[PDB]
């Protein structure tokens, strides 16, 4: 196709790679933390951690769409006046 390049980090064998000292959080780390905290909260409530269907995310996204419908109704009734 186009012969892309996967993410790679070889071993260093050199005294620079031990010197990073920075903590910066990626998109993959925050998505992995979202997945772990949605597997634990579906592991102390649903008591099954297969994560096929997660109902807590369904409820929380339902109340978030409620708040979003509130905000869109506010921006719709503000432009009326």
């Amino acid at each position: 196709d186009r012969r892309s390049f996967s993410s790679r980090t070889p071993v260093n064998e050199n005294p620079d790679g031990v010197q990073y000292r920075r903590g910066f959080v990626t998109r993959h780390q925050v998505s992995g933390w979202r997945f772990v905290m949605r597997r634990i909260a579906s592991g102390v409530a649903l008591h099954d951690t297969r994560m096929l269907v997660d109902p807590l995310r369904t409820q929380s996204r339902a109340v978030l769409t409620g708040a979003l419908i509130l905000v869109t109704g506010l921006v719709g009734c503000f432009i009326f006046s």
């Binding site: 996967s6 993410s7 998109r27 993959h28 998505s31």
Partner: protein, 43 residues
């Protein structure tokens, strides 16, 4: 003086399945594209 023993065969304990358990490796860190919000504000 002493009694007599008869060497009846040993009972067998449930043996360990000494094999080679293999685990498939983890996936390969797929590069998610940042969602490019013009196709994210529509939902």
């Amino acid at each position: 003086s002493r009694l007599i023993f008869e060497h009846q065969r040993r009972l067998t304990p449930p043996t360990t399945r000494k094999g080679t358990i293999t685990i498939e490796p983890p996936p390969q860190l797929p590069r998610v594209v940042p969602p490019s919000l013009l196709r994210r504000v529509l939902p």
